[PDB]
Symmetry: C11
Subunit: 87 residues, 11 copies
């Protein structure tokens, strides 16, 4: 059994948004960094399995993994463009 | 049996819309933060399950979460853009 | 056997639209809030479900909930843009 | 066995449009209000079903309900913008 | 055994289109009125069926109904916008 | 065995196109009227079948008809708009 | 066993394309006429089949033809736009 | 068992492409005529099959042909527009 | 066992890219031609299979070839527009 | 057992990115060429396999290959536009 | 059992974003290089498998790898365009 997740409620500032923006930027960027670490970690293992299992499903799912890995990396640069337009 | 949800009813102000805008912004940001925590929590477990199972399904399902985590990230920054246009 | 729903016919003013807008915005904002309340209640349960039993289907279904939760968050802020344009 | 539907035929005015617009606006708004009642009625039940019967299908189908409930909400606001567009 | 449908040929005027527009407008608006009646009649029954069945299929199919009910009601007002553009 | 169809090759005039435009306008308007008459004939039967079958499948397909009834209606008004555009 | 098709090479004029255009228009229009006839033929039979038998498939299949019949009609008008643009 | 295809390598002109354009024009047009001939050949037969074999699959797949036959006719006229664009 | 493919590494000129362009043009065109030859070869065989075997699958898959054959034809002319824009 | 892949880290220069562009251009073009060789090599074999097996699946998958072969071919010339835009 | 991943937190500077862009550009270019390497490594093995084992699945799955390989290349040169528009 896993311990239930305690949800942490952020402090929002509707009339002073720039500080919400700054924190959210840090959070998004952290997450994108976690994602790429996770994806790469998964890819290395997924690759060797797909090479050795000699089964089309392994290869098909590896292709889906790559598709996602590209989407993630694509977004990291898109983030800075969204930030530039906000500032 | 789980406890039935008791629906909470918001106070709406059509003629004084900004009160609503502020509160709705605080909720949306709160939710998005919840979303990113829930996704992260699940991601870490789904990653380890996929690595040790040698099952394409587990990898596929991990990719789906990453897909969702990315969309969640995209929409956090797009939220601030909508606020900038509203203000 | 559940009690059959009794439909509630609203009063509409084609000649006096503004009173309808406000009432409909009151209703829409209510439903929006209800939806986030429902989604969050389900997300918490679905997350623990997905974590406890090694079952990709539960993980897959949790992802879909996040996807739907995100779409509902998006529209809450787009509602305010729709109202600003109307006035 | 249910009683067959008896179709009511409306009166159309091709060269005096505004009369038709006003009447169709009343119908559209009525239908949408019924729709949001039906959806909310099902949502509450489908939510408690999805929580209690530990099976992915119930959650998946609850997600599709929320998607449809969101889409119906969007169109209630867009209805009014369609009206403002018409002179 | 139902009675074979006898197709009724309309009268067309390529060089006096105004009479055709008006005729086709009366037909389209009539059909959209029939659809909304038919769908609303279906939704009442489909709702109660999905409430008492305790099976995802019924809920799934009710959602599909709601989606089509939405599309129909949206195109009713869009019909007018097309007519305004024609005149 | 149903009677084989005998295909009817029309007369075409690339250098004197206005004759063809008008001739095809009548064919299209006729076909659209044929479509609408057929769909309504089917709709009335499909509806009562669905109402009394207590089967999700029947509702699903009825929702498929309405979507097709709506699409045919849309293209009828737009047929005139395209004719307006042709000088 | 049916007689194999013997393919007929068209005469093309790369530097004097107008006679290619004219013949290709005469082929396209012919083919579109052939299509609307084949669909109407099929639809007449498909409708009666979907009436006499209480069978969702036959309805579903009838709807798909109407969908295809609407698109064919749409493209016939859109053919006269492309031909107008080429001249 | 069929004879293996022998691939015919074309001669290209990077710096005098007008010769390439013309040849490629004759090829594409040839292949479009080939396609419309082939599709009509299939349709004539598929329609009779769909009429006689009391199985929806025949009608569903016939509809797919019609969709495809429409698509192939759309691009015949779009070819000439593209050829016009190439000055 | 087929003979493993040996990857032939091309020579690229980053700051003399026009040579690479011309080389790539001849390669792309060679392949476009190979494609239309392979598709047409397959289509002649697929057409007769579909006609004689009286199976919806054969008709369905034949339609997919044509769909793909139409696409290859499209890109062939679109290649020349891309070349025009590059020079 | 296949040999594990050993990932080679590139050398990145954020300040003087022109060197990186050129290297990546060589990489991209090289890989696009590989891709073109790999598709062709497969196409030859799949084509004959589809012709002789008399099974829809083989023809279906051949069509899929061709669609992918066209996408690859399309992107080779679009690559040169991308570089011209960066120049 | 594989060793659990340890997530590494980056340092983000919301009001000194250039440091972040440079580091992220390096990371994204590293990952895109990793992806192309992984995709090529899989493609080589998938190619021979598809050729040697007469099975449509292996060919289908290979095509999916190629699609994903093409997308990755596309995105490598877009990365630079994205960096150019940031400067």
């Amino acid at each position: 059994v896993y311990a239930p997740l305690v949800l942490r409620d952020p402090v929002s500032n509707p009339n002073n948004r720039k500080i919400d923006q700054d924190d959210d930027y840090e959070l998004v960027r952290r997450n994108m960094h976690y994602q790429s670490q996770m994806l790469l970690d998964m890819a290395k293992i997924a690759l060797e399995n797909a090479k050795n299992a000699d089964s089309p499903r392994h290869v098909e799912v590896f292709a889906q993994l790559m598709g996602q890995m590209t989407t993630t990396n694509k977004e990291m640069l898109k983030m800075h463009k969204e930030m530039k337009d906000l500032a």
